[PDB]
Amino acid sequence: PTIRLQEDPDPEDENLYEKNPDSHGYDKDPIVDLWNMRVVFFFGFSIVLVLGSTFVAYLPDYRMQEWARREAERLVKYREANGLPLMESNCFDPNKIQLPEDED
Amino acid sequence: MNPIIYTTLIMTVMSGTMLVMISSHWLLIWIGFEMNLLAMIPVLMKNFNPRATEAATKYFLTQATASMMLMMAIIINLLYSGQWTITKMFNPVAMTMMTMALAMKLGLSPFHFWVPEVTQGISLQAGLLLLTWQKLAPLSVLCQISQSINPNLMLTMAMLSILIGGWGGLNQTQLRKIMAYSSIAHMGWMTAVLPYNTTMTILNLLIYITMTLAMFMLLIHSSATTTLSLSHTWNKMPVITSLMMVTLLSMGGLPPLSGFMPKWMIIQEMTKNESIIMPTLMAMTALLNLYFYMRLAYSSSLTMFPSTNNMKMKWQFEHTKQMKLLPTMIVLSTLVLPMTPALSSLN
Amino acid sequence: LQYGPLAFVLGERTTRKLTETSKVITVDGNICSGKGRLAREIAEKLGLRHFPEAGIHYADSTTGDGKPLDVQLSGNCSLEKFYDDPKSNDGNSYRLQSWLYASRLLQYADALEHLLSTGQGVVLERSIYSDFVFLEAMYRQGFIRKQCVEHYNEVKKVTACEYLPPHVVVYVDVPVPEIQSRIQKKGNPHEMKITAAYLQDIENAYKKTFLPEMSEKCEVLQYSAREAEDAEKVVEDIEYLKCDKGPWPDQDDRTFHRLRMLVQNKLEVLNYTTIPVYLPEITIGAHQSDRVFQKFTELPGRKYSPGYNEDVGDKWIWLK
Amino acid sequence: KFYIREPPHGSPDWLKVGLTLGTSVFLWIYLIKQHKEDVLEYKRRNGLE
Amino acid sequence: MTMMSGRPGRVPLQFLPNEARSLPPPKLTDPRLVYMGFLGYCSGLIDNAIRRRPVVSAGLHRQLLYVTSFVFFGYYLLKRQDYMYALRDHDMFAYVKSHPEDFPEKDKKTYGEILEEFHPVR
Amino acid sequence: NVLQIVRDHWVHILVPVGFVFGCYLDRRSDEKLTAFRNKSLLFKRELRPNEEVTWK
Amino acid sequence: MLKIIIPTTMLLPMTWMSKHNMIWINATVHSLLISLISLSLLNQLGENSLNFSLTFFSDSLSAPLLVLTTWLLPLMLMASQSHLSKETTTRKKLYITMLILLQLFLIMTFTATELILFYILFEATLVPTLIIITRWGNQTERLNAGLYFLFYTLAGSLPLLVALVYIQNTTGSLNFLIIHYWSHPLSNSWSNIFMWLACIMAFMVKMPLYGLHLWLPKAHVEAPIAGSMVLAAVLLKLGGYGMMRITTILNPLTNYMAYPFLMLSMWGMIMTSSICLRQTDLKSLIAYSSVSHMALVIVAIMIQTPWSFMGATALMIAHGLTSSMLFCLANTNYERVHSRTMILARGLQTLLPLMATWWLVASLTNLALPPSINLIGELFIITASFSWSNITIILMGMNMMITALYSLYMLITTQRGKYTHHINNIKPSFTRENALMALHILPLLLLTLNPKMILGPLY
Amino acid sequence: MPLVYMNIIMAFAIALAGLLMYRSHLMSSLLCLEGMMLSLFIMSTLIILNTHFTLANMMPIILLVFAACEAALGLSLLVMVSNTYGTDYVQNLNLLQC
Amino acid sequence: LLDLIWLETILPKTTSFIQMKMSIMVSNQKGLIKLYFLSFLITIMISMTLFNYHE
Ligand SMILES: CCCCCCCCCCCCCCCCCC(=O)OC[C@H](COP(=O)([O-])OCC(O)COP(=O)([O-])OC[C@@H](COC(=O)CCCCCCCCCCCCCCCCC)OC(=O)CCCCCCCCCCCCCCCCC)OC(=O)CCCCCCCCCCCCCCCCC
Ligand SMILES: CCCCCCCCCCCCCCCCC[C@@H](O)O[C@H](CO[C@H](O)CCCCCCCCCCCCCCC)COP(=O)(O)OCC[N+](C)(C)C
Ligand SMILES: CCCCCCCCCCCCCCCCC[C@@H](O)O[C@H](CO[C@H](O)CCCCCCCCCCCCCCC)COP(=O)(O)OCC[N+](C)(C)C
Ligand SMILES: CCCCCCCCCCCCCCCCC[C@@H](O)O[C@H](CO[C@H](O)CCCCCCCCCCCCCCC)COP(=O)(O)OCC[N+](C)(C)C
Ligand SMILES: Nc1ncnc2c1ncn2[C@@H]1O[C@H](COP(=O)(O)OP(=O)(O)O)[C@@H](O)[C@H]1O
């Protein structure tokens, strides 16, 4: 036969615009395609995007940024008035630390 | 062959294995091995042809040599301590000979040549029996004498078995030889952890037996013994090829599949000892088995090979005989990893 | 209960049902000869089951409903275009020959299963032992290649060796010019293009290979055209045969058990017809294979197992 | 519709169906009973109630 | 090496010693039992698919039997597994209690007295 | 007529039901980790005259 | 966090029980709802992590990754339904099943509290990806691509398993909280050096580190579009997540074991950026872009500073979004002209203006135009490297120039010039493709508006 | 051990070596197998007689029984091989490879 | 030079070459019991001396 095998020919690609000039590119069935467009748009842009962005914008301050700012204001006020240094090099009281006896 | 005679021979094979497993006397264990071999020889020749005759002859010669060495080791042990009970094996030379004889019976490398040949020469049912049921007796005996075993010899043979299983399997287009090399590698894995923990040996044996049963039953369902004949199964029963693909993935050891569990537990057990280098090499080597399982999956399930015209006639008919345990075997081969802590009931 | 080792262990034995009228009969002959009428008359007189010659859609007749399917999903070959274009470059000739051999193997398995299950005789038109005459006629006329002949020989070698040959072979002899006259008188516009050399090749193949090698298994009953209309004489000629020369008398219970397990399970029967020998005439690409299989699975009674297709009126599925 | 008997007929095999359902129900009630006695025995041995 | 093969008082083929009755049985809603039932349901589905039957609807009695059998075996499997782990813990604690020299409780040191080297990241 | 509507769109309750089941199981999991409820040095508190537990 | 895991497991039978013509709709809607639910994980604390149970926990490093995974699922669904139209119903359901299983494994991987469970899930992610690539790829190179993807990964990951079980036998636990609180320094011995290498190489090959990246161009070019999306956006970030987790127990050994990987990362960053300048395949260019950005991420993780960790987190999120968008943009042209060669279809701005705008925005984010989170991450990493050593700015500086060059080269080659005369089948952009590009790009700028949500736990 | 024990063990080793190296005939290797069985019988009998283990006097009979079973098995296989090839050469058993 | 040749040459191509060569070495046996029973004899003798003589 001068052939090697029985095979279907490679078919041409279908244009969704031919049977549906406003086809939205979701499906060949116009009704299913239209509703796929609608659900994608509503649940992506209207619900997740805008409402999720609002939710994230108004999340309560569990990172304690404002609490830390107010605590630092109290500490600075107290230390400035008393004449104490604003900050201490050692964050742990040396009285609770026991260095090794001998360094030689 | 008469069905009654076939059933009698199968029960005699199983009776020999059970006699090995329940005996306390070395003579009774040797008798169990003899009975098992005597009944097993005709089962390999059930479908008579020159290849089956050659496979039976090679099997008989190998196993008879192994049993002769087994008996000699028993007699030497008796000579140096008048004990017939299966115990710590008071003599080292006798223990070495016993280890070599049991390795010959199992098909561990260096004595691994017979397994690919006997498996290719017999039918798929005989291969199923040979690669599943025939491992129980030597492994049970090895488990009972694990304390007196010399780690250097057993570990050498286990690592050689893993290496040779991978390398030999890399070169095969016949499915029975692929199964035989896979069996060799899994035997190596089983015997690598034996000196440290026999529960892991039992767990690996059970999981391997389940996966092997599933694979052989899938191969019998779709009557394929070569890679190219298995490449047609997609055009007749695609579900069979999909299940075979998942089972092949499980055999490879990829998580979250059940196949991964024995290797994981054996690696953990070996690292509970010092033993760091050996598990690393064993995993790197099991990558080869994974490679040729993946090649089989490429050929049978993930791509579609050309078919023939006469497959249309086969489309019209159904499979008459049905294997009742195949779904359970597939499920146990694939989805059992979350139940891993249940291995405690094995000890 | 399904026949198997358990049925053989207790009770069932084939050797007891054979009642001197088992006698697998095949009635061979060239094209357009009246072998079918003779076969039907023999079956009616002797009380045997008649099997009409297996065509392209023989396998369709036995599964699902007996109605034939589309040629694309069954056969994928045409007898008419074989006569129109015997030298087509699409492999129609050898594809048809291979499909017909597979159909004949299936029909032989069905007849053997019926005989071994009931003890009743069967009459066939042609057999797997006769199918090669058409292959030789095609090859000598240059309609197929030599590789196709080698593939046919491989499949026949691994398939036809597992069964028992017919007890008696009946041959109807009709000369080639008379065959041409009959074909012209018929009226079918495709059979008129059959050259006389094709019929001569079929006749040479028959008389120089089939009958000689079949006469060693069992004696052959040959008949000229005029002595084939008298069916009662042929039947009474059959009743006085001494059949103790072939493999049939040397069959005991266990061999019959093996053969009976083989004749059922038609997948086992057809196993070796689809061997992975890649001839362009019969090799089908993956895309076309997938498309045709998807087409087949959409037939009204084909998606599931027989008793499980609710779209053809299967009830109580959820308890089966 | 079918050319041959197709032995599984339109009605299901009632013997097999009944045996299957009976086995399932027997196993379920046995498991419930066993769990109840196990709970009672555990509570008795450790003296909870 | 076999850790529990020869523990005194062990009955050869019991699968469930009388001592195990002193442990709380697994709840019938144990997630492990539910996973075993899921395994049985998967086996039933695969059985339907292999036999070319409607996968979800073909045999409800068969699927029920599959799920029930897997749950039934899993219950006793879980009981035995829990018993083995309880045995292991019991033996561990008894051995530690009976060999005080090998398990000393040394003096506790606070982090204010332990000198740890500091490795800068720069 | 709701028979066909239900048989065509009953697959739309699986995911919300899974969500509520996951919420329930998370509450159940939280119920098993109360060994230090109202016991930390930082949050130890005297109970109100009516309440029973500080958190659920 | 079963309130997220269980709905995906319910996506599975919802897909397998749907009508033949509603699978895409149902999967998309419920995937988007699951993403909305996962959005609640962004409420993180300042001191410790959210410890849901003994098994699952959520940190400030894994919450954006989970959100990215759940958001990527619907986009893959929209991108896949075009070229799968001729497929049978069962195979379409199997494709969706593969995607759902991949999402489930990824979701469980980012929240596992133990390292062995994390390993099991991070390795289970292999099977769906390999099946997708080798079954639904287009060309015959997909088989080799699958083999390369599998073995490169496993050869790195198995020593990690050995090291993990060894560590558990040594310290008694693999729980991440216990590991962090009970951390002890690593001495300078050959055993410790090889333990470091075993704990690091799997994540290195996942990034992938330069010289160990050859699998990535093959796998990312030969895969279908959804495969490429999930391979570039999420699966590469497994290496970075695992490396930031595991480096807790590797100090102070890292102080000098990081040198070869740092040199490889910087020089191979330069090399892969240069490779992008001469590339005839449009998808391979995007793959090598991914390699360069991940080399930057490797450097940031290796130098071990708070600023470098913040930059690494931001860069991983930004790169996921940008690379997924670029792959989708290339797939549109491939579906139009059935060829990947970059100079075949030219002057496309004349024929498709809105798609040209999408191309411009994607290539602007690729070159890290401020104040995009791409640039935030890149600049944090550059500052951290400058503090590490002042000479890194030269290598970093060269990379910035090269990245701009090849990004705009891609843009000008594909969009500008004159349209090829012989190609007349360039249909207008569908609504689906435009919605896909918009859903890729809008979250990027929205995250720019509030950048502390992607800056990690070191913030 | 005495000299007789070493001699019997040497006989066993020689028969094993004989079995391991095949010449042409299969029957010669079967004879070597029987020789190993005989050597084991002699060794076990000597050990049991020396230690006066009365109940162990019956084991060598069992050994002989199973030796006979093994020899019958080997002879049957030889009959089949010879019927296939008209010769009992081990060179003909080369249809299956590794 | 680097990505398409040498990086390919060292890690994956070397591994493939070595595995293929060892597969050819291991799997190509004639199936003659004489040769590998001689192999068995060598293994047995080595085993007694190498691992058995050292206890
Ligand atoms: C981790 C979390 C949990 C996950 C658990 C693990 C995963 C899920 C469980 C796995 C096992 C379960 C299913 C087993 C049977 C499936 C076999 C099968 O063929 O299915 C076809 C069958 C369709 O057949 P049909 O409907 O009769 O008619 C169509 C024809 O049959 C048309 O059929 P056909 O034969 O003509 O079509 C040919 C097709 C047929 O080939 C197949 O169908 C392949 C199926 C192979 C089964 C998987 C192997 C064994 C399981 C191992 C899974 C490993 C998972 C771990 C990760 C590794 C990934 C592999 O073959 C191909 O097309 C070749 C494609 C090549 C792709 C290769 C990939 C295959 C492996 C993928 C496995 C992924 C997991 C399962 C996917 C789902 C399968 C349904 O599918 C189904 O309809 C059943 C699925 C749905 C059942 C569950 C629904 C439950 C009820 C709903 C309510 C839920 C309750 C909620 C409670 C709360 C109250 C509201
Ligand atoms: C087509 C035509 C285009 C041009 C025409 C457009 C017309 C103008 C519209 C453009 C708007 C201009 C932007 C200017 C900024 C104003 C908004 C800003 O003020 O809000 C920010 C808030 O923005 C949000 O916080 C950021 C949005 C969150 C982004 C998350 C994306 C949603 C999920 C989607 C999928 C996720 C994928 C990525 C995975 C990680 C402020 O943050 P914050 O300083 O606090 O507020 C202080 C007061 N609070 C705290 C009480 C609220
Ligand atoms: C791949 C999945 C593996 C599945 C393997 C088969 C599962 C189904 C087989 C059903 C087992 C039936 C046996 C139970 C009936 C009573 C017999 C009982 O008395 O046997 C006891 C023994 O109990 C059995 O071993 C328990 C069998 C349970 C095996 C399942 C564990 C698999 C590991 C975890 C994987 C998850 C499995 C999920 C199953 C669906 C006797 O103990 P003992 O005589 O003193 O031990 C002898 C061996 N020693 C001394 C050397 C230790
Ligand atoms: C293609 C991309 C692949 C990925 C790249 C992976 C990178 C791996 C590189 C490993 C980094 C360092 C490994 C070991 C640390 C130091 C290396 C050594 O050269 O340093 C000196 C080591 O001295 C000498 O070099 C001895 C090592 C010589 C033998 C090593 C072989 C190197 C040859 C190159 C082979 C290529 C390796 C990669 C294969 C692809 C330090 O002196 P010393 O203080 O004494 O040793 C420190 C350890 N102590 C403290 C326990 C003693
Ligand atoms: N195996 C075959 N190969 C090719 N053609 C065949 C074959 N069998 C039957 N035919 C064709 O079928 C037609 C009639 O078949 P035949 O049985 O000979 O006539 P009738 O219908 O009278 O029995 C003829 O054209 C014959 O060539």
Side-chain angles (χ1 to χ4, degrees), chain H residues 68-90:
Chain H
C69 297
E70 205 137 275
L73 200 58
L75 280 185
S76 298
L77 287 166
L78 190 139
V79 170
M80 280 321 104
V81 167
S82 189
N83 280 344
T84 291
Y85 296 105
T87 300
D88 74 324
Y89 284 166
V90 293

Side-chain angles (χ1 to χ4, degrees), chain D residues 11-34:
Chain D
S11 294
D13 189 342
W14 298 110
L15 190 75
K16 296 208 68 175
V17 165
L19 284 198
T20 307
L21 293 152
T23 314
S24 323
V25 184
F26 163 75
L27 280 166
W28 267 112
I29 65 110
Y30 193 91
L31 180 71
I32 298 284
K33 189 224 227 313
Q34 171 87 56

